[model samples]
Target chain A: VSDFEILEMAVRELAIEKGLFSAEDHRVWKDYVHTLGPLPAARLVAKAWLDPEYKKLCIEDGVEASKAVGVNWVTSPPTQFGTPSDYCNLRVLADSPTLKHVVVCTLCSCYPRPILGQSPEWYRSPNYRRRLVRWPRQVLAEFGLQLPSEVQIRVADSNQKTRYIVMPVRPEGTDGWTEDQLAEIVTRDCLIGVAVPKPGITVNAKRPVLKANRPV
Target chain B: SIREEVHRHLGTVALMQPALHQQTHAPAPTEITHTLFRAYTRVPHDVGGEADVPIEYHEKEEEIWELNTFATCECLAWRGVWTAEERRRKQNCDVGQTVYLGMPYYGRWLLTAARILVDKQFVTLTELHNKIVEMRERVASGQGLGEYLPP
Candidate 1:
């Protein structure tokens, strides 16, 4: 057995045996986490684009705005309060004509999983963390996104509980599109700010998929 | 000669642990390299602005163990066993320089959770050691969670 497999079982068993936490707590948490995905976050972005007031709310108070799409960051997880690791500070970074934003946790992958779901593997890698903060423009270019030199690319360093999700400016071809249609364009990539919303691109920029030995 | 060689091997085993390479001496402040002091003191988790080569970014399917590890770590935090900040510190920075850069991301999280239980006295070290032995045997016998049967 992998040392990790043996050790993980040992830790869980001991924790339960000692009353540090219950097996039911872990099971309930897993069930709650399985329910999280990008849909609610995408809907929030679409809702903001369709409504000016919500756009303002998304910018001014992301925690409160999260309720619009039915994700209560505080009570969504098994904990009555916020997930202990992901505290309740949610920041929706709105991209403007002159500015763009991307999110990274330089310390580690501090994603708003409660809203955006589990962070993608690449986002959690050391390479992304090391390069994104200092070379966002170059990195974004690597992702096939190029902005004019005049546009400022802001990299949000998610070093603390305050997590961020990018709100890309609604695209041109998406004009007259309903909220559902608009939401489709805002994939996990767009929300993370590496890719912008586009009409044809309904999925993330695909590269390679590292197949798991035992995938969940 | 064999006895002397055995003593030498003991030295090699302990030296395997990661350390500040050539932490030469507890020199006076002025004696140390300014760059070395700054780099070592910086939080290992803080990787922003460091130079790195661009590589192909790819998605990964989560292993069942990795998913379970995430839930367990979060559950530990949910139950107030340790704060998130403490988990970050232990997971990201406390594992030493080699482990910080070498281990998989979730691997670090899993290790830290195991450590916190012992560190906080929630579980004794002896208990953890015994549990792991029990688990390994159970896994080998095809009893639960299955063995690490290499395909």
Candidate 2:
């Protein structure tokens, strides 16, 4: 057996025996996780892009704005308060022409999974987590986005429970694009501030996909 | 475009490192101060402005076992067996100093989940220990039933 399997079995068995949660509860939670993805978050961004007032609301209050996309950060999950790992605080960091934002969790990969999906592989790596807070410009440049040194590149190290997503300024080429079309371009990377959105790019930047041994 | 740039930026940013001043060992417990205790015992997540160097950002292929482990971890949290906060505290903070720096991030998570089960009394330590031993034996005997092992 793989090390992960052994540990998983041990943990699950122990948790069940110790009254942390029931066996049935685990099954139910697994079912809940099966339903999560980036669709709701994408819809939120799309709606904000289409409606100026909605954008203002999103900027002012993220949790309330999430309701527009049919997601309540606090009550959406089985736990009414919020998921234990991802808390209720959702900060929508809107990127402007002069100021850009990037995010990292220096200690661990603390992502807004309920809103966005699982974090990208690179985001979880020690390498990315360690450097982004110190050398923001050098990192952005490597991502093929060389900003003017004068622009304020705020690197939000999500050290606490507060989760963040970047709302990049609408690209010029998509002046007359529909919400659906625009949503396609706002890949997960853009929201994380490691990449920017461009027209016709519906998915994240292609990388060598590491296939799962037992892909779900 | 932003995604590409982000990936590239992350790649470059990953290279940053802190200046290392290696030492062989430490003095007795008497040498410890409150600040040193706080600094040493601080949660690993508390790294906000620590110095570091840049590195390449690369995507990792998930192992089959890794995916299953992820699913299992979420399942544990979902079922109310343990909250994610508890998991984080135990896995990220409670694992102690050695494993914190020694293991990969997810590796710690997986280990902590195992620990919570036993620690909370859902599963006995004896049961877990036996299970691990049995699992190891099964693998060694060529009858293990996972992706990585032959059995």
Candidate 3:
């Protein structure tokens, strides 16, 4: 076993023995995390695309708008207050024909986990965290995105309590699409601004996945 | 053209850190420059605008232990053992440069979980050390691979 694996057991057991939190509390928290994903955030975008008022709400107040998608930044997690790592501030950065946004946690991987699930490994890498802020256009191009110089790319540095997700301008070709159909194209990458949504694309761009020692 | 730019960026990244070893055993105030002082005391996780090379971004499969560590951290905050902000202070900043860069992302979370237990007097260092030893022994006896770790 890896040293981290052993240390994790020791720490958890010791904490439980000391009455810090019960074994069940730990399990419950894990179960809650298991239920998180990018679906809620995608639905929020689709709803916003369908209704201008909702889009305005998402831009003005992400935490309250998240309720339309069934995620309460304050009470969604096992902790009635909020997830310790993710906090309660969720800022949805609205995109436009002339403006684009990408998210990065330069200080640490401070993501909107309640709405967006766990952050991608690359998002947490020191390399991405380091360069994204400075050379965003270059990095986005590497992710198979290329925008004209007329479009401004705003890199949102999630360095403090607030978390961010990009709300890409809705794409065309589906004039009468249902919310689910629209939501399907708003992939996690679209929400992160690495890739914009399209009529057919539903998944984040395929990249190599480093396997864990004992994967979940 | 993008590849050339990426290579140039890699070269730039290679030059970011100090090249040669310099011995400084508590230098005098006169010897300290603003740049040196800022480099030494700056919050390590604030890496925005740093030079870096472009590479193929990848995803990661979550480890069972990693999920457990995540839960333990949140549970700690849930019960008021520590706040998320406090966890960030220690896990992201207080572990120092070596462990901050050397350890896996979740490894810091695990280390800080153990740290909070000791730092808050919930468990003595001695008791925590003994528990680690006992857990390691469980592996020797072929019991560490159960439903939970070190079962």
Candidate 4:
């Protein structure tokens, strides 16, 4: 078996044998996680783009605003309070011409996975984590984004439990586009601030994809 | 000649240095302060002001094992063996300085999950240890499954 598999089996078996949680509980949790992806979050962004009041709500209170898209941060998951790792706080950082935002969890990758999908591999990389907080402009430059020195590039180091998502400045080309069109441009990288939203770019930048042995 | 060349290459590769310089020594208990304790105790995710350097950012192709490990960690949390928070606290924070900075991010998570199974009594230390030994033996033997090691 793969090293991960062997270690996983050992850990799971021991956890079951010891009384960490029932074997059945793991299955249930897996089922719950299986349901999470980028859809709900995309929908939230879509709705906000359509409704100014809702966008205001999203800016004011993201957890409550997420309810508009049918995800209750507290009660949505199996845990009534919230997922243990991704706590209840959801902060939406709005980007503008003068202000830009990027996120990093320097110590560990803490992401809003329930609403957003599983974090991209780069998000979890030690390289990105180590560098982003200290050298925002240089890191963003590597991502093909060069902001003027005067533009405030606020790097939100998700150090505490609080999670964040970038509300990118709406792209220029999609002036009369529908919500679907808008959502398409708001790629995951755009929301994370590594890339800017544009009319035709619907996915994160093409990068070398590492295949998993037993990918979900 | 080939063995000598390989050894020479290995020596050169070992000379690669990390961007950050850190010094460590066993500190006296009296030297540890409450702030230091909290800083040390604080979960690894709480890394707001920690110093770091700029590097090339690229997406990684997930290994099959990495995916499995992710699912496994989540499943363990799902089952109530531990909360995701607990896993994060232990995996990201509790692994100590050496492994924390030394190992891959997920490597720590995998290690922490292993620890939880034993620390919380889900699996006895003996059972976990035996399983690893058995797995390693399986790897040594050609009959093993998954990604086999060269015999």
Candidate 5:
């Protein structure tokens, strides 16, 4: 086994043996992470796009808006307080025609994990973390998303405790689309503001996936 | 000895971060420029606007160990061993520029989990070292790794 793999095992075993936490606690946390995905965040955006009041609520209090999508920021996870890394503060950045939004953690990957699931590898990469904030337009263009020059690109840096997800402006093609259909288009990339939801594009842009030694 | 050498190599390569190599041991106070001081004291994680070239972004398959590390860190927080903010502080900021950029993302998480145990006095450095040695021996001997690792 590799040093990191061995070290990881040792640390986990030691932590449990020393009673810092139980083995059951570790299992429960993993189960919680397993249950997370981008669907709830997608539903949140779809609901917001369909209802102006809900959109307002989303902007005002994302933690509360998360409930409509079956996510309780504070109490959903095993810890009633909230996930340790991802605090309870969930900010939904609403995009307008004149204004676009993108999210990055300049420091580390401080993502809205509970709602949006574990961050994409690129989202957590030092390259994305470094370049996204300074070169949003360039990076977005690379992600196959090019916005109009008139649109103001606001990069939400998740530097501190507050985690953010983008509520992109709904596309015109889906004028009477149902919440499920609208949600279908709001892929993880759209929530991250790297891509906008469009008709027929239900998943993030396909990229090369680096395989793990022992994949979960 | 292998771990010590590996750590030394890690530190050595970290200095390769696009800078001119120079020797300035305890340089005069007047010699330190404002820009140099800012660069030196800056938190490594705060790389929001740092200059970097673009690269092909790709998704990574989740490793079992990485997942377990994430869960262990969270569980530590859940049990009140430490808060997420505290973990972030130690894991991201306190590891310094070298380990911050040098180490793998989840590797840092795993390191911090062990760190918190020692930092909080739940375990001693000796105990951690001994456990790591034992784990390495067990792996080499084809012994079942305990409850944490699949038997």
Candidate 6:
């Protein structure tokens, strides 16, 4: 077995044996995480797109607007306060014609996991963590997005307690689309500012996938 | 076109850490430059604004051990054993240079969870030692891959 596996068991058993936390609590947390994905965040963006007032609410208070899409950051977990690490703060980065936004945790990989699922492996890579802040335009171009330099590129450094997700400007071809249709294209990459949502591009850009030696 | 793009990016990537390349000798303590000192002192995980070239991003499959390690870390925080910020500080920064950059991301999380038990005095070092030894023994004596990890 890998050393980590043994260490994990050791720590967990020790934590439980000492009454730090119960097995039931661990199971409950696991079950809660299983319910997380990008859909609720996508739906939240879609609802905002359909209603100007809702969009205002999303920008003003993402944690409150989260309730519109069925995500209650406060009471979602068994703790009823918030997930111990994730906390209750959420910031929805709304994009406009003159501006663009991308999120990065310069300190660590601090993603909005409860609403957006786990961060992508690439997002956690040292290479990305190194370049995204200073060389965003270059990085975005590599991801197949190249905006005019006149459009100010804002890198939201998620180095503190805050977590972020981008709200890309609705694309042109997506006009007259329903909330579901719009939500489909707001893939996690779009939300991460590495890709722009477009009509019929509901999936993240395909790349070579590296398989685990053993499945999880 | 694809070949050109690949080569272009690879060349740029090659330039990212030029100072570390082809070095002849280690610098004396007095010889450390401010740039070098700042480079060494900065948290390895605070990597924003550092130079790197773009490459093909990967989508990786999660491992069973990774999932368990994540749960263990979160559970520790959930039960007041540690705050999430404290967990991040240890896992992301305090693990030191060798681990912060060398190990798999979740690998640090698992190690931090293990260290915290001893650090906080919730479990004595001997208890952790015995548990690991006991688990290893169970696997050695044909326990058939007990629980989450493989044999």
Report the error of model 6 at residue B2, Å.
15
Q: Which candidate is the best by TM-score?
A: 3
C-alpha lDDT (0 to 100) for residue A1 of candidate 3: 85
lDDT string for model 4 (A1-216, tens) is 556667766666566666666667666776777788777776677678788898898888999998887889999887687777788999888777899999888767888887886788778876788778877888888899988888899998876778888888777777778988888777788777889888888888887676654554
Better of 4 and 5 by DockQ: 5
Segments in model 4 whose C-alpha atoms lie over 4 Å from true places: A213-216, B1-54, B63-65, B75-85, B134-151
Candidates' chain A TM-scores: 0.98, 0.93, 0.98, 0.93, 0.98, 0.96
Q: Can you write out model 1's per-residue Cα lDDT over A112-171, one digit (the tens) per residue?
A: 989999999999888999999888989999999999999999999988679999999999
CAPRI quality of model 2 = acceptable
Scored against the true structure, residue B66 in model 5 reaches a CA lDDT of 92
lDDT of 2 by residue, A1-216 (tens): 446666665555556666666677666655666677777777777788889899898888988888887778888877677777788988888888789999999878988877886788889876677778888787777776777878789998877778988888888798888888888888888889988888878877776665554445
List, residue by residue over B1-151, the lDDT tens digit for candidate 3.
9999998997798778677778889999999999999998988888888897778889999998999999999999999999888999999999998889998999999999999999999999999999888977888788754455444
For candidate 1, the docking band is medium
DockQ in order: 0.56, 0.38, 0.70, 0.38, 0.60, 0.67
lDDT of 4: 0.75
lDDT tens digits, residues A131-214, model 6? 888889888888899988799899998877778989999889877899999999999999889898898898999987889755
DockQ of 6: 0.67
TM-score of 3: 0.92
Clashes of 3: 0
Q: What level of docking quality does candidate 6 show?
A: medium
Query: Considering summed lDDT, which 10 consecutive residues are worst modelled in model 2 chain A?
Result: A207-216
Ranking by DockQ: 3, 6, 5, 1, 4, 2
List runs of model 6 lying over 4 Å from the truth.
B1-37, B149-151
Candidate 4's TM-score reads: 0.80
- Ten-residue stretch with the least lDDT total in model 1 chain B: B142-151
